[PDB]
């Protein structure tokens, strides 16, 4: 009974970062070999856990969060970072225990003339708490005058499209990101490695 | 009214510290990206710093570790604290409401920062004598070795304005400014009409009247 | 970092013309580009964002186009308040943030050769131990001009500074001042001081010179 990591890593469509997807991995056997062998990921960074020993560990639960961002922004998917993504879209906690995996997806998520499906939150009054997901689309009020749901001066739509084009520099090309969070609590461990 | 009003610029020595202020009206500072952008004399725009509505701050590499951007919500005011200033920090500094994809739509009027170790000094005024050779001659005044800017130059107490070119000052490697003011006049007037350049440098309370005549 | 290069550095046009200036990003940036206008002594003014969206209140004569690496600002009918410097900016409020170096839009006129004058240092200045020699290029167009200092027929490099006026409000020409600075001893070690001016309005370079003394 193997964990459905393929549904996450090999999904055909990915979510926007502001509406990042969370898959709950439980009651299964986790084989993390796909992370070591391939060298098909451009980012593989673990915190609070040893990367090479993942197959020896059991956990209460696993979370697989998935989204798409710019290459320039993959550095923000880590504990203690700041910027538009970490502040307004996807925030890891300082004591994060898990791994961040990312790979370039320019051939899949970029379209000629701009792909407008992937968005990021551009305006927000305060930062996100760790693992907070804000899907609001209310007009952002930048001044004292209320917006009443119409765009205009001091009244911005809070989301902006990445508009991924294949001509983009590597830093502005789309990257697919999966964050594995490892939860160890005083409960039965339902996700163990092989054997 | 929607406006940004800046203050706090001035003259300071390298290694000194200066705080710039930017009072806003028409929008809330704490709810916007707010940026500082500077422009050195005769150069283009250089982004200096940004503060997010959520509090994150970022700096250009040229000022990182020396400048600190901040804000006061009760006064709806942006601040830039500049420490360990250097000569190349000399610039007009602007604040602006930044909008990322929406560009920077509201800009302040700018405030001037000059970082130099030069001593305040009034200029020497030397003649640029008309050559001894349409009959139009050129004469002028070299306004050399002054600090800080600016100087003003008139001719014959304002009665001579046609044909006057007063050039922008250049900063010499000594740290002092130099400037020239020239005028083309009819060659026939060299013997009869007196030409005097009037140089004012208020920072040193210097007023000089230099008579420019043919030489021999 | 992604560089932003504007072309050309100086562009001359007339009232009523259709004008285009170009901004090139060293790598593709989709439509994350803004255009600003700045007049001397004043703050920038946002013209275009998103490569093509006109900022509210800006006249429809400004239009932005392009996506990826090549962007163009077009002024469909030039009016006198359009003569200014124009900057582009990559749109991403996270370091590094880069502006183009600027394109100055200037008033076009006919070619006018410079009238050239040379001025030896005054005796008063020589008393102080320094010699400034001044070369004046008066009322020329276009602005491109080359001043070459020669001392006893040796071309001088690294000991001169120059300054250019703004375009004259009534005849649209420029004037240039170049200053060669020497110590008194160096100045007295040589005889022939000359500035050679090359400009579009001259068939061949014009040299103005003097001999130290008389
Ligand atoms: C996602 O799909 C890829 C491609 O089908 C999987 O990679 C292959 O896995 C098989 C099974 O062991 C290997 O025989 C192939 O050599 C692999 N090919 C490549 C190019 O890596 C990958 O395992 C899938 N990922 C997950 C998490 O299920
Ligand atoms: Cl702010
Ligand atoms: Cl650049
Ligand atoms: Cl030119
Ligand atoms: Na996770």
Q: Where are the domains of chain C?
A: 4-107, 115-211
| A108 and A121 co-located in one domain | no
Query: Domain segments of chain B: what residues?
Result: 3-115, 124-212
Nearest to C52 by CA among B109, B56, A113: A113
| A177 and A160 co-located in one domain | no
SS3 of residue A154 by DSSP: coil
Tell me, yes or no, if the two domains C4-107 and C115-211 fold the same way. yes
**Contact between C107 and C167 (Cβ < 8 Å):** yes
Residues from chain A contacting residue B26 (CB–CB below 8 Å): 143, 154
Give the separation between CA C214 and CA C205, rounded to whole angstroms. 24
| A70 and A142 co-located in one domain | no
Count Cβ atoms below 10 Å from residue A55 Cβ, excluding itself.
Answer: 16
Q: Is A138 exposed, middle or buried (0-12, 13-18, 19+ CB in 10 A)?
A: exposed
Nearest chain B residue to A127 by CA distance is: B54
* Closest CA to ligand 1's atom 3: A10
Give the separation between CA A60 and CA A28, rounded to whole angstroms. 11
Residues from chain B contacting residue A125 (CB–CB below 8 Å): 31, 53-54
Give the separation between CA C181 and CA B126, rounded to whole angstroms. 14
Q: Does C114 touch chain B (CB under 8 A)?
A: no
Query: Determined by which method?
Result: X-ray
Nearest chain A residue to B28 by CA distance is: A143
| A109 and A122 co-located in one domain | no
The count of residues in chain A is 195
Domain B124-212 superfamily per CATH: Immunoglobulins (2.60.40.10)
Distances (CA, A) of A182 to A26, A48, A49: 11, 9, 9
Count Cβ atoms below 10 Å from residue C202 Cβ, excluding itself.
Answer: 15
Candidates A83, A113, A169; nearest CB to C29: A169
Residues from chain A contacting residue C31 (CB–CB below 8 Å): 114, 163
Beta bridge partners of B64: none
Task: Give the range of the structural domain holding residue A149, as residue numbers without chain letter.
Answer: 114-165
Residue ranges in C94-165 assigned as alpha helix (H): 123-126
Q: Which of B25, B32, B51, B58 to mutate to test the interface with A (most CBs of A within 10 A)?
A: B32
For residue B84, the distance in angstroms to the closest alpha carbon of chain A comes to 26
| A88 and A151 co-located in one domain | no
Residues 51-70 of C with CB under 8 A from A: 56, 67-69
For residue C25, the distance in angstroms to the closest alpha carbon of chain B comes to 16
Residues from chain C contacting residue A165 (CB–CB below 8 Å): 28, 30, 67-68
Give the sheet arrangement for strand C192-199, strand by strand: C154-155, C145-151, C192-199, C206-211
Ligand in nearest proximity to the CA of B32: 2
Domain count, chain A: 2
| CB-based contact C30 A162, cutoff 8 Å | yes
| A130 and A49 co-located in one domain | no
**Contact between A176 and A103 (Cβ < 8 Å):** yes
Give the separation between CA B155 and CA A89, rounded to whole angstroms. 64
**Residues followed by a gap in chain C, C→N > 2.5 Å:** none
Candidates A153, A162, A165; nearest CB to C28: A165
**Contact between C179 and C133 (Cβ < 8 Å):** yes
* Closest CA to ligand 1's atom 18: A38
DSSP state letter for C100: -
Q: Which residues contact C192 (CB under 8 A, 6 or more apart)?
A: C150, C151, C152, C153, C209, C210, C211, C212
Nearest chain C residue to B32 by CA distance is: C93
For B179, list phi and psi in degrees, rounded to 5. -150, 155
Give the separation between CA C161 and CA C193, rounded to whole angstroms. 16
Ion ligand 3: residue ranges with CB closer than 5 A: C 3-4
Count Cβ atoms below 10 Å from residue B109 Cβ, excluding itself.
Answer: 16
Could you tell me if residue C66 is left (phi over 0), alpha (psi between -120 and 50 degrees) or otherwise beta? left
Ligand in nearest proximity to the CA of A2: 1
* Closest CA to ligand 1's atom 11: A34
Candidates B27, B55, B101; nearest CB to A142: B27
Ion ligand 5: residue ranges with CB closer than 5 A: A 63, 65, 179, 181
Candidates A84, A114, A168; nearest CB to C94: A84
* Closest CA to ligand 1's atom 22: A34
| A145 and A176 co-located in one domain | no
| A139 and A185 co-located in one domain | no
Count Cβ atoms below 10 Å from residue A4 Cβ, excluding itself.
Answer: 12
| A17 and A88 co-located in one domain | yes
CA C209 to chain centroid, in Å, comes to 26
For residue C93, the distance in angstroms to the closest alpha carbon of chain B comes to 5
Q: Does B126 touch chain C (CB under 8 A)?
A: yes
Q: What is the dihedral of CA A54, A58, A59, A65, to 10 degrees?
A: 30
Q: Which of A38, A54, A108 to mutate to test the pocket of ligand 1 (most atoms within 8 A of CB)?
A: A38
Largest CA distance in chain B: 73
Nearest to B37 by CA among B48, B29, B23: B48
- Rounded distance from Cα C63 to ligand 5 centre (Å): 45
Residue A10 Cα: closest atom of ligand 1:
1
| A101 and A35 co-located in one domain | yes
Q: What are all long-range contacts of C164-171, with beta carbons under 8 Å and residues at least 24 apart? A: C164/B167, C164/B168, C165/B165, C165/B166, C165/B167, C165/B168, C166/C40, C167/C106, C167/C107, C168/C139, C171/C109, C171/C139
Residue ranges in chain C assigned as alpha helix (H): 123-126, 184-188
Distances (CA, A) of C205 to C109, C115, C116: 22, 12, 11
Give the separation between CA B32 and CA B56, rounded to whole angstroms. 11
**Contact between B191 and B204 (Cβ < 8 Å):** no
Q: Does C67 touch chain B (CB under 8 A)?
A: no
Residues from chain C contacting residue A169 (CB–CB below 8 Å): 2, 26-29
SS3 of residue A70 by DSSP: strand
Largest CA distance in chain C: 66
Both tokens assigned to C213: 């003394």
Q: What are all long-range contacts of C183-186, with beta carbons under 8 Å and residues at least 24 apart? A: C183/C129, C183/C130, C183/C131, C184/C126, C184/C129, C184/C130, C184/C131, C186/C131
**Contact between C196 and C148 (Cβ < 8 Å):** yes
| CB-based contact C56 A84, cutoff 8 Å | no
DSSP state letter for A18: G
* Closest CA to ligand 1's atom 4: A10
Of the candidate CATH numbers 1.10.3720.10, 2.60.40.10, 1.20.1300.10, 2.40.50.140, the domain formed by B3-115 belongs to 2.60.40.10
What is the CB-side half-sphere exposure of residue B107 using CA atoms within 13 A?
22
Of the candidate CATH numbers 2.60.40.1220, 2.30.30.40, 2.60.40.10, 2.40.160.40, the domain formed by C115-211 belongs to 2.60.40.10
Both tokens assigned to B203: 């920072």
| A101 and A185 co-located in one domain | yes
Q: Entry resolution in angstroms?
A: 2.3
Both tokens assigned to C118: 């040379």
Both tokens assigned to C56: 């509210």
| CB-based contact C89 B103, cutoff 8 Å | yes
| CB-based contact C2 A153, cutoff 8 Å | no
How many helices (H) and strands (E) would you count in chain A? 4, 12
Give the separation between CA B106 and CA B96, rounded to whole angstroms. 5
Query: Cα angle at C141 between C136 and C145, to 5 degrees?
Result: 55
* Closest CA to ligand 1's atom 20: A38
| A161 and A172 co-located in one domain | no
Chains meeting A at 3+ CB pairs closer than 8 A?
B, C
- Rounded distance from Cα C164 to ligand 5 centre (Å): 61
Tell me, yes or no, if the two domains B3-115 and B124-212 fold the same way. yes
| CB-based contact A87 B27, cutoff 8 Å | no
- Per CATH, the number for C4-107 is 2.60.40.10
CA A41 to chain centroid, in Å, comes to 15
Q: Does B212 touch chain C (CB under 8 A)?
A: no
**Contact between C74 and C20 (Cβ < 8 Å):** yes
């Amino acid at each position: 009974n193997l964990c459905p990591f393929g549904e996450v890593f090999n999904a055909t469509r990915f979510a926007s970062v502001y509406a990042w997807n969370r898959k709950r991995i439980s009651n299964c056997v986790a084989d993390y070999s796909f992370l070591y062998n391939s060298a098909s990921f451009s980012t593989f960074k673990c915190y609070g856990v040893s990367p090479t020993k993942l197959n020896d560990l059991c956990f209460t639960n696993v979370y697989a969060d998935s989204f798409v961002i710019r290459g320039d922004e993959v550095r923000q998917i880590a504990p203690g970072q700041t910027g538009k993504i970490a502040d307004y879209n996807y925030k890891l906690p300082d004591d994060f225990t898990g791994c961040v995996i990312a790979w370039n997806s320019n051939n899949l998520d970029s379209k000629v003339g701009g792909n407008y499906n992937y968005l990021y939150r551009l305006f927000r009054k305060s930062n996100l708490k760790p693992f907070e997901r804000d899907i609001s689309t209310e007009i952002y009020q930048a001044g004292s005058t209320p917006c009443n749901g119409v765009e205009g001066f001091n009244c911005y739509f809070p989301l902006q499209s990445y508009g991924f084009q294949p001509t983009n520099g590597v830093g502005y090309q789309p990257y697919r990101v999966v964050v594995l969070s490892f939860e160890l609590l005083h409960a039965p461990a339902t996700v163990c490695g092989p054997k | 009214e929607v406006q940004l009003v800046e203050s706090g610029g001035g003259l300071i020595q390298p290694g000194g510290s200066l705080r710039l202020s930017c009072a806003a009206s028409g929008f809330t500072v704490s709810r916007n990206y707010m940026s500082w952008v500077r422009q050195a004399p005769g150069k283009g725009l250089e982004w200096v710093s940004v503060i997010y509505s959520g509090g994150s701050t970022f700096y250009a590499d040229s000022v990182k570790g020396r400048f600190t951007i901040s804000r006061d919500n009760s006064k709806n005011t942006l601040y830039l604290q500049m420490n360990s200033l250097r000569a190349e920090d000399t610039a007009v500094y602007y604040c602006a409401r930044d909008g990322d994809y929406y560009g920077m739509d509201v800009w302040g009027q700018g405030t001037t920062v000059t970082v130099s170790s030069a001593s305040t000094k009034g200029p020497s005024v030397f003649p640029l004598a008309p050559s001894s050779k349409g009959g139009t001659a050129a004469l002028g005044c070299l306004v050399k070795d002054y600090f800080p800017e600016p100087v003003t130059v008139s001719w014959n107490s304002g009665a001579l304005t046609s044909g006057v070119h007063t050039f922008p000052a250049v900063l010499q490697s000594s740290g002092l400014y130099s400037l020239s003011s020239v005028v083309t006049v009819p060659s026939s007037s060299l013997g009869t009409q007196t030409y005097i350049c009037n140089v004012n440098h208020k920072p040193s309370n210097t007023k000089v009247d230099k008579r420019v005549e043919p030489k021999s | 970092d992604i560089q932003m290069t504007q072309s050309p550095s100086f562009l001359s046009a007339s009232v009523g013309d259709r004008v285009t200036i170009t901004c090139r990003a060293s790598q593709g940036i989709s439509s994350f580009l803004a255009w600003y206008q700045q007049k001397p002594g004043k703050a920038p003014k946002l013209l275009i964002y998103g490569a093509s969206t006109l900022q509210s209140g800006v006249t429809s004569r400004f239009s932005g186009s392009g996506s990826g690496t090549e962007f163009t600002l077009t002024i469909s009918s030039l009016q006198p308040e359009d003569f200014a410097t124009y900057y582009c900016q990559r749109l991403d409020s996270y370091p590094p943030i880069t502006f183009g170096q600027g394109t100055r839009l200037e008033i076009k006129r006919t070619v006018a050769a410079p009238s050239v004058f040379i001025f030896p240092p005054s005796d008063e200045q020589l008393k102080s131990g320094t010699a400034s020699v001044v070369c004046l290029l008066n009322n020329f167009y276009p602005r491109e001009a080359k001043v070459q200092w020669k001392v006893d027929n040796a071309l001088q490099s690294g000991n001169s500074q120059e300054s250019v006026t703004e375009q004259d409000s009534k005849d649209s020409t420029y004037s240039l001042s170049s200053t060669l600075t020497l110590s008194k001893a160096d100045y007295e070690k040589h005889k022939v001081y000359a500035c050679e001016v090359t400009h579009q309005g001259l068939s061949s370079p014009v040299t103005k010179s003097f001999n130290r003394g008389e």
